[PDB]
Design a protein around this motif. Structure first.
Motif, mmCIF file in Angstrom:
data_model
loop_
_atom_site.group_PDB
_atom_site.id
_atom_site.type_symbol
_atom_site.label_atom_id
_atom_site.label_comp_id
_atom_site.label_asym_id
_atom_site.label_seq_id
_atom_site.Cartn_x
_atom_site.Cartn_y
_atom_site.Cartn_z
ATOM 1 N N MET A 70 -7.474 -5.735 6.586
ATOM 2 C CA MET A 70 -6.369 -6.112 5.623
ATOM 3 C C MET A 70 -6.623 -7.419 4.934
ATOM 4 O O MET A 70 -6.846 -7.569 3.907
ATOM 5 C CB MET A 70 -5.222 -5.100 5.969
ATOM 6 C CG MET A 70 -4.004 -5.755 4.828
ATOM 7 S SD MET A 70 -4.306 -5.005 3.473
ATOM 8 C CE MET A 70 -4.664 -6.643 2.495
ATOM 9 N N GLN A 71 -5.735 -8.145 6.024
ATOM 10 C CA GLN A 71 -5.428 -9.509 5.734
ATOM 11 C C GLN A 71 -4.756 -9.681 4.197
ATOM 12 O O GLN A 71 -4.988 -8.917 3.463
ATOM 13 C CB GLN A 71 -6.892 -10.164 5.529
ATOM 14 C CG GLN A 71 -6.691 -11.665 5.254
ATOM 15 C CD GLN A 71 -7.694 -12.494 6.484
ATOM 16 O OE1 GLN A 71 -8.511 -11.966 7.099
ATOM 17 N NE2 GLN A 71 -7.329 -13.798 6.415
ATOM 18 N N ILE A 106 -2.176 -12.683 1.838
ATOM 19 C CA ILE A 106 -2.591 -14.153 1.040
ATOM 20 C C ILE A 106 -1.213 -14.560 0.437
ATOM 21 O O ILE A 106 -0.175 -13.875 0.178
ATOM 22 C CB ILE A 106 -3.413 -13.812 -0.205
ATOM 23 C CG1 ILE A 106 -2.716 -13.070 -1.225
ATOM 24 C CG2 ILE A 106 -4.811 -13.264 0.369
ATOM 25 C CD1 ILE A 106 -3.837 -12.515 -2.326
ATOM 26 N N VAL A 159 4.209 -5.544 -6.937
ATOM 27 C CA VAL A 159 3.349 -4.441 -7.343
ATOM 28 C C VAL A 159 2.788 -3.423 -6.302
ATOM 29 O O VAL A 159 3.039 -3.723 -5.247
ATOM 30 C CB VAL A 159 2.132 -5.381 -7.838
ATOM 31 C CG1 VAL A 159 2.589 -6.330 -8.998
ATOM 32 C CG2 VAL A 159 1.370 -5.940 -6.744
ATOM 33 N N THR A 160 2.184 -2.467 -6.728
ATOM 34 C CA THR A 160 1.525 -1.592 -5.858
ATOM 35 C C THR A 160 0.182 -1.118 -6.263
ATOM 36 O O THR A 160 -0.231 -0.406 -7.198
ATOM 37 C CB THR A 160 2.520 -0.251 -5.783
ATOM 38 O OG1 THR A 160 1.556 0.889 -5.191
ATOM 39 C CG2 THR A 160 3.041 -0.110 -7.138
ATOM 40 N N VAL A 161 -0.865 -1.642 -5.336
ATOM 41 C CA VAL A 161 -2.195 -1.218 -5.753
ATOM 42 C C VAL A 161 -3.187 -1.583 -4.490
ATOM 43 O O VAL A 161 -2.570 -1.624 -3.488
ATOM 44 C CB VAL A 161 -2.798 -2.373 -6.499
ATOM 45 C CG1 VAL A 161 -2.148 -2.222 -8.293
ATOM 46 C CG2 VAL A 161 -2.598 -3.763 -6.314
ATOM 47 N N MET A 162 -4.407 -1.383 -4.648
ATOM 48 C CA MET A 162 -5.358 -1.246 -3.631
ATOM 49 C C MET A 162 -6.110 -2.588 -3.358
ATOM 50 O O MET A 162 -7.065 -2.871 -3.998
ATOM 51 C CB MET A 162 -6.427 -0.038 -3.783
ATOM 52 C CG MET A 162 -7.508 0.028 -2.474
ATOM 53 S SD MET A 162 -6.730 0.166 -0.918
ATOM 54 C CE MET A 162 -6.983 -1.692 -0.508
ATOM 55 N N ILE A 163 -5.671 -3.361 -2.526
ATOM 56 C CA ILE A 163 -5.874 -4.638 -2.059
ATOM 57 C C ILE A 163 -7.291 -4.511 -1.083
ATOM 58 O O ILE A 163 -7.169 -4.673 -0.110
ATOM 59 C CB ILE A 163 -5.127 -5.736 -1.659
ATOM 60 C CG1 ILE A 163 -4.174 -6.309 -2.831
ATOM 61 C CG2 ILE A 163 -5.772 -6.699 -0.721
ATOM 62 C CD1 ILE A 163 -4.968 -7.508 -3.445
ATOM 63 N N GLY A 164 -8.534 -4.274 -1.866
ATOM 64 C CA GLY A 164 -9.739 -4.096 -1.049
ATOM 65 C C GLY A 164 -9.486 -3.248 0.161
ATOM 66 O O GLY A 164 -9.638 -2.006 0.073
ATOM 67 N N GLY A 165 -9.232 -3.891 1.356
ATOM 68 C CA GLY A 165 -8.926 -3.304 2.711
ATOM 69 C C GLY A 165 -8.322 -1.889 2.449
ATOM 70 O O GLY A 165 -8.979 -0.812 2.047
ATOM 71 N N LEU A 187 -0.044 -8.457 -2.282
ATOM 72 C CA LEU A 187 0.654 -9.493 -1.570
ATOM 73 C C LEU A 187 1.873 -9.710 -2.192
ATOM 74 O O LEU A 187 2.210 -9.170 -3.142
ATOM 75 C CB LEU A 187 -0.533 -10.655 -1.647
ATOM 76 C CG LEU A 187 -1.142 -10.713 -3.072
ATOM 77 C CD1 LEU A 187 -2.445 -9.898 -3.349
ATOM 78 C CD2 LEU A 187 -0.207 -10.508 -4.230
ATOM 79 N N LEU A 212 -7.433 -14.618 1.739
ATOM 80 C CA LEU A 212 -7.988 -13.379 1.839
ATOM 81 C C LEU A 212 -8.954 -13.255 3.049
ATOM 82 O O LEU A 212 -9.072 -12.227 3.855
ATOM 83 C CB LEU A 212 -8.795 -12.659 0.767
ATOM 84 C CG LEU A 212 -8.311 -11.327 0.286
ATOM 85 C CD1 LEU A 212 -6.838 -11.156 0.001
ATOM 86 C CD2 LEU A 212 -9.278 -10.746 -0.987
#
Ligand SMILES: Nc1nc2c(ncn2[C@@H]2O[C@H](COP(=O)(O)OP(=O)(O)NP(=O)(O)O)[C@@H](O)[C@H]2O)c(=O)[nH]1
Ligand SMILES: [Mg+2]
Lengths: 184, 44
Positions: A1-2, A4, A42-48, A53, A177
């Motif tokens: 996850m990590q 930022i 906001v609500t989205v898919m941060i890669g992992g 953030l 990230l």
């Protein structure tokens, strides 16, 4: 996850809201204030994994005029701004930012971003620089000084013509990230 | 995805704008000359 921490310091948006904001709207040649209402959730898919953030923007309006996080941010990847238009100020910006960003924080990295490059490229504003110089900071120039202090990297971006935006700004958050690699 | 030596995580993707702030300061002094104000101020 990590995660930022988007925190910009300087006389330029660089890693500010102007990126995603103008990218969608708000216009550049209008006004700058309403943005004070940062802290957007906001609500989205941060890669992992599905997560987002939190870009805490600092301001001096009704919202919160007492705030002051930009004082001495303990972040690891700062955001240094600049512009192609330069009437022999390049020497100042370098000797004005390097000793500043380090003053508050014992040696703090940064990232160079391009935007005005779209307009500064014109021979008009350039003439204004001519008064003292005329040499416009080319997209390759910022990269030179940027790497000089092993900051990060100068990517392409434009809040007028759209030279990527997310690209350069992606390099800014990238440092948060995960530990990126230089080019030497 | 983005991909940049960091778990190849996609930077702030799209659909990430729900609006959760107050502020809203009508045009006070616009932006004529560059040199934005530090993050301490942000807006006029
Ligand atoms: N070339 C260049 N221009 C820069 C850089 N950093 C900032 N700028 C300039 O500064 C401007 C950013 O405007 P700014 O007032 O900071 O944006 P904002 O406050 O997020 N907009 P808002 O009005 O919604 O608050 C850009 O249009 C850009 O031209 C940089 O590294 N390079
Ligand atoms: Mg803004």
């Amino acid at each position: 996850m990590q995660t930022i921490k988007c925190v910009v310091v300087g006389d330029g948006a660089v890693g500010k809201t102007c990126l995603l904001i103008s990218y969608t709207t708000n216009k550049f040649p209008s006004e700058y204030v309403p943005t004070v209402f940062d802290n957007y959730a906001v609500t989205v898919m941060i890669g992992g994994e599905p997560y987002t953030l939190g870009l805490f923007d600092t301001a001096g309006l009704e919202d919160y005029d007492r705030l002051r996080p930009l004082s001495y941010p303990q972040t690891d990847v700062f955001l240094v701004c600049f512009s192609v238009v330069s009437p022999s100020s390049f020497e100042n910006v370098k000797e004005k930012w390097v000793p500043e960003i380090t003053h508050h924080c014992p040696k703090t990295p940064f990232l160079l971003v391009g935007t005005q490059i779209d307009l500064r490229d014109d021979p008009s504003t350039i003439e204004k620089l001519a008064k003292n110089k005329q040499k416009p900071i080319t997209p390759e120039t910022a990269e030179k000084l940027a790497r000089d202090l092993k900051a990060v990297k100068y990517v392409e971006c434009s809040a007028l013509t759209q030279k990527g935006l997310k690209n350069v700004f992606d390099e800014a958050i990238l440092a948060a990230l995960e530990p990126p690699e230089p080019k030497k | 995805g983005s991909g940049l030596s960091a778990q190849d995580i996609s930077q702030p993707l799209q659909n990430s704008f729900i609006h959760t702030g107050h502020g809203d300061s009508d045009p006070r002094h616009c932006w004529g000359f560059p040199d934005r104000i530090d993050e301490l101020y942000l807006g006029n």
